């Protein structure tokens, strides 16, 4: 039934301060214009994009923390294999591609994001048929 | 099998400064008693009600992020068809009435809430039977 | 099926004030060296140990908030019967001993942990065989 769970918290200021820096895992998962507008800790860009990163991380912990997570997990093409997106109705959906996709081969991920003030959070649950 | 998951954080300080503001969605869920007590930035009733609030928020996100989001849109019929209570013993429970109780006819709602510092939080999970 | 869920936030500042203090239920569950290092609010220890404590609370509430508790009454030696071990490359897992282990006899528990800035958090999820 439940393969996994994850929870992550993220400081929006601290994230805003480090999201835009040529050579990070941010570069490999956010758009330059997304990293750039998010550089601004007072913009909604930043507040929203912190939440999306918190979902990504929550998903990582949920899998990592499972069995479906191999004993040498996590090479480092695992941040854009997991993609956290808004769906047509305004709701979060995870999109797996790549090698993680193949692990999590046949599992449903539910996710929820939230943000308040300078803090942003997410949790993700992994199910199994 | 998990049909919905929600999480939401609320700012106990901001919450308490708007819980007694007239016209709001709060007056349909808390008693004028409560709303006024929950007006002091650190008064135990603030923290507690911030949390019931977060609880509610998080059940709403779990539903509007599921398949039975089948519109009867966001009428804030939902805001008053859904209620979070602190049972006799003090355990948090969900009460559904009206429309939502019909849509979530046979689903199971699990919540938990907490509050630390200036911040309250909660999480709900929706199960298909 | 899901039997219960649990979530908990902890102020690491406040925890590292009240953790090396005498007669606290901390003493009954953490090691005198453990609590002594978690006094430095800015240390690794205090972080690391706040997330373990939120873990315990998140599992305590998951079980508590259920009908798999029997009109809950906390058994004694809880907190310390609920262990938050890790699995080498740093993977959380819960360990039960004693009464709870019996009460939660054939339950599987999922936890995740997390700590950002000065708050730490955890979530738990209790499922039937």
Q: What is the per-residue DSSP string for B12-23?
A: HHHHHTTTT-TT
Query: Does C67 touch chain B if contact means CB atoms closer than 8 Å?
Result: no
Residue of B nearest to C4 (CA): B110
Closest to C60 in 3D by CA, of C43, C72, C44: C72
Looking at chain B, how many residues does it have? 129
Quick check: A123 and B5 CB within 8 A?
yes
Quick check: B9 and A116 CB within 8 A?
yes
Cβ neighbours of C109 (radius 10 Å): 24
Q: Is A22 helix (H, G, I), strand (E, B) or coil?
A: coil
- CA distances (Å), origin B9, targets A10, B21, B88, C85: 12, 20, 25, 28
Contact criterion met (CB below 8 Å) for A4 and A66: yes
CATH class name, domain B1-129: alpha beta
C65 CB-side CA count, 13 A: 29
Q: Is C17 left (phi over 0), alpha (psi -120 to 50) or beta?
A: alpha
| Cβ contacts of A27 within 8 Å, gap of 6 or more | A21, A35
- Report d(CA B27, CA C29) in Å as an integer: 43
C2 neighbourhood in chain B, CB within 8 Å: 2, 108, 110, 125, 127
Out of C4, C10, C71, the one facing B89 most closely (by C-beta) is: C71
Q: How far is CA A95 from the centre of its chain?
A: 10
Contact criterion met (CB below 8 Å) for B116 and B42: no
Out of C8, C64, C72, the one facing B114 most closely (by C-beta) is: C8
Cβ-in-10-Å burial (0-12, 13-18, 19+) of A62 comes to buried
Out of A7, A10, A73, the one facing C112 most closely (by C-beta) is: A7
- Report d(CA B93, CA B85) in Å as an integer: 5
Query: Does B61 touch chain C if contact means CB atoms closer than 8 Å?
Result: no
- Residue B98 phi, psi (nearest 5): 70, -145
Query: Does C111 touch chain A if contact means CB atoms closer than 8 Å?
Result: yes
| Cβ contacts of B104 within 8 Å, gap of 6 or more | B63, B68, B96, B126
| Residue indicated by tokens 């003493």 | C27
- Report d(CA B15, CA C2) in Å as an integer: 31
- CA distances (Å), origin A82, targets A23, B25, B32: 19, 36, 46
Q: How far is CA A47 from the centre of its chain?
A: 14
What technique solved it?
Answer: X-ray
Resolution of this deposited model, Å: 2.5
- E strand intervals along B12-116: 82-86, 92-96, 108-116
A10 neighbourhood in chain B, CB within 8 Å: none
- Report d(CA B75, CA C15) in Å as an integer: 42
- Residue B39 phi, psi (nearest 5): -70, -30
- Report d(CA C63, CA C73) in Å as an integer: 11
């Amino acid at each position: 039934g439940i393969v996994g769970v994850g929870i992550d918290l993220v400081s929006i200021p601290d994230f805003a301060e480090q999201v835009d820096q040529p050579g990070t895992v941010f570069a490999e998962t956010f758009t330059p214009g997304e990293r750039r507008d998010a550089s601004d800790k007072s913009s909604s860009a930043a507040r929203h994009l912190a939440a999306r990163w918190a979902a990504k991380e929550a998903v990582i912990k949920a899998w990592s923390g499972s069995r479906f997570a191999q004993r040498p997990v996590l090479p480092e093409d695992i941040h854009r294999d997991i993609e956290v997106v808004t769906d047509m109705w305004g709701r979060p959906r995870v999109r797996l591609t790549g090698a993680i996709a193949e692990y999590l081969a046949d599992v449903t991920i539910h996710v929820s994001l939230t943000h308040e003030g300078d803090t942003a959070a997410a949790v993700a649950i992994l199910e199994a048929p």
